[PDB]
Symmetry: D2
Subunit: 254 residues, 4 copies
């Protein structure tokens, strides 16, 4: 049919959103439009990475599930049993997206569960729901097309995390490479006095501890701030803020 | 009726290849199978990023340009004029994938040109060729859906190449931070004597013609070999080989 | 007679001035040697000096930071040469090997009490000149690494933005209107925002706003735009 | 005795480049003529050299606990401490300890003992600074290599060295593909990226598999998260 129309739009979104970064919200919105049904891109753990509502049913049980952006733990592990595409599931199924729970009112309450694979592993679960039309081969082409693209974008987000988790640690260590012996001993006792990420630094409370100059403490802060690890601010008679997630971790290796 | 059957085949490859290739040969092979037509994924400058033949054509006019993995300059800048899916462009054209001398046999010979765009930038050009019948909405979906994925895969490669081209320089620079002054000036004169990637390191004069210790050259070479920059092999009278594309470039800064 | 008192002092200055090197090391010798000090580079440059009596001859007077050179006998003076050149005298102790220490004084002529305070110092100087280079190549290369790390975090579009951003600034600092760059190539402004963050994350730049007037950006790395000028 | 200042001059006027203060201990031991014992503040024998071998555990790396704490509160130069003479000179900006049964301890012997005690400090600080230099750089390269990976081969690398259970070992081809379900070409691309940064140095051995040897001290550790 003129399914070609609904694919060009789905493609047109992807044909700019391609590259960085990954936006599951705007992506689920387009699926919601071209599949003409509710969309729930669900993580392995049951977390909602993105979603979009085409037809909204007024139910405190459901809209709440959407509020934590988390599905019930029992229902989450149930998706693992679904290995292949399971189309048009009934309101009396253990997989339905319609715990209404007066299901007589919901005769046309349908549910489609397409697993989201990145080849090597099941990365998530695409959940559909609709009250108007049956899920045909037409609606499955768009659902599976999307599920494949989601899988790539989940594997990308997970790849880019591992990349940056290591990159951030790398620049932290290079910043440490800059320090002298005293400057390191300085930095250690500095962030012990703070005991966290933010705080005010009493530079006179140190520099008497070991007899090392307060000017040494200045180098140690500039070198870190030079590599963007921190950023200090002149505050009365010094405020420092850590700009790196892994800085505190790598520092705690005495 | 199932276009779905032809989409599952295409989807099956895509997810089961998300694990980092990128392989345009594998992609082209499947398209050629599900689209049921010849596939030519063309780079911006005419290079074939990938291909797969469904129907063996008979001219060595094409069998040589295919053997060269490169399209003519004239035909390439012709592809820029195509801004959107052009379907079934005769054999009488300037866009046809069948440039022949004997055209009277290729009346049913056709061509379809789907552009490949991402981020806003025209990345490549998908080209289809078939003798059978005209490309239907059936094939146009599979063509456009493929051309969309090829787009975001080209963008992956360009971002991962930057990821690597810059990382490689970082490893080089990090190895240079290990050197002393004498250790550095040694490396400078070593690869001034080589005048290339590989060569034999005499150093019987090269070291003491300028007056550089033969032991400080070892430490300098061991440090470079530590970061995987180089790799030396032994002999009576040392052979060296640069394993980093960007090492020489970064070293050309005094 | 106890030279220990004069060598305990000199030593108690180097333990404190351990690392972070010659402007203050020259003051060190000028005090304990009690003579003018001139720490001269292998090629003439003044790495540090300190004056004790200050002959106001002005055939010499140092903001040149470079002598009228060629001076070449520090060439030729391979050993400590005491009391060269009234008693306007000079002691020249070599540091060159693998710079040069020059002492000047009106009065005594170093005695034998001695250059052993100068030779002692002249050795420590050499170790700190060797420290200078090692702790320079360390930083000059590591900075280039941080920059390349920052660039590796960019996408193709995020890079295209950066290439244009600092092609507009025409220098180190300046105001940036993120408005128009998005219109010159047709890429999202959020891309420009994302690109600037990745640089600012590694401390390459700083980027804080000026309202709708624009965003002010200041490059904090000496090696950024250099490495950026490579295709 | 200006040559006696020139002894200590060119003995470490090399100076330089790396830090080998075992070669420093004999420099003092030859010229102060002494048994030299460069001791860390906590107790480890950072270096030593013996001119006068005594018919007398140095084997090794630390001293008697409350002999070290005795040295700690020797805040000043104290020569001829008897018991076989003894001289203890502080090293701080470590501890230098001398001993002899010969020309006592001259105050010229003290000059060279005190002057050396200063140069030691500088080279302890230099060694310590250029060690933290290394230890951090040794981690930076590992993390650099790890950033090159993606989802699958991080998981591949995680399982590989988990099975290796140590530094070196043989990897049985595709026996590993069972336990992660990813293409096994992924494993190769993983091992290649690591050894491209000097983290490993592998070797293929035909139908047996592939041998691998970790070359980075900090790789095994940093990989342990997870």
């Amino acid at each position: 049919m003129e399914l070609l129309a609904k694919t060009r739009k789905l493609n047109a979104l992807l044909q700019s959103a391609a590259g960085k970064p990954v936006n599951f919200r705007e992506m689920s919105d387009t699926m919601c439009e071209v599949i003409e049904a509710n969309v729930f891109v669900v993580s392995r753990r049951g977390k909602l990475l993105g979603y979009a509502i085409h037809q909204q049913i007024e139910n405190e049980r459901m809209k709440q599930m959407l509020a934590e952006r988390q599905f019930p733990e029992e229902y989450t592990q149930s998706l693992f049993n679904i290995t292949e595409t399971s189309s048009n599931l009934d309101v009396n199924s253990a997989y339905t997206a319609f715990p209404v729970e007066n299901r007589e009112l919901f005769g046309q309450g349908l549910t489609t569960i397409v697993p989201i694979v990145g080849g090597g592993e099941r990365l998530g679960t695409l959940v559909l729901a609709r009250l108007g039309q049956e899920f045909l081969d037409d609606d499955l082409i768009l659902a599976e097309y999307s599920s494949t693209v989601v899988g790539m974008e989940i594997l990308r987000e997970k790849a880019e995390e591992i990349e940056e988790e290591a990159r951030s640690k790398a620049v932290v260590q290079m910043a440490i490479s800059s320090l002298s012996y005293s400057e390191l001993e300085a930095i250690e006792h500095i962030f012990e006095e703070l005991n966290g990420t933010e705080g005010l630094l009493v530079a006179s409370k140190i520099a008497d501890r070991v007899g090392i100059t307060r000017s040494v403490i200045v180098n140690a802060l500039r070198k870190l701030e030079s590599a963007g690890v921190i950023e200090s601010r002149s505050l009365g008679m010094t405020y420092i803020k850590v700009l790196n997630d892994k800085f505190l971790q790598e520092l705690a290796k005495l």
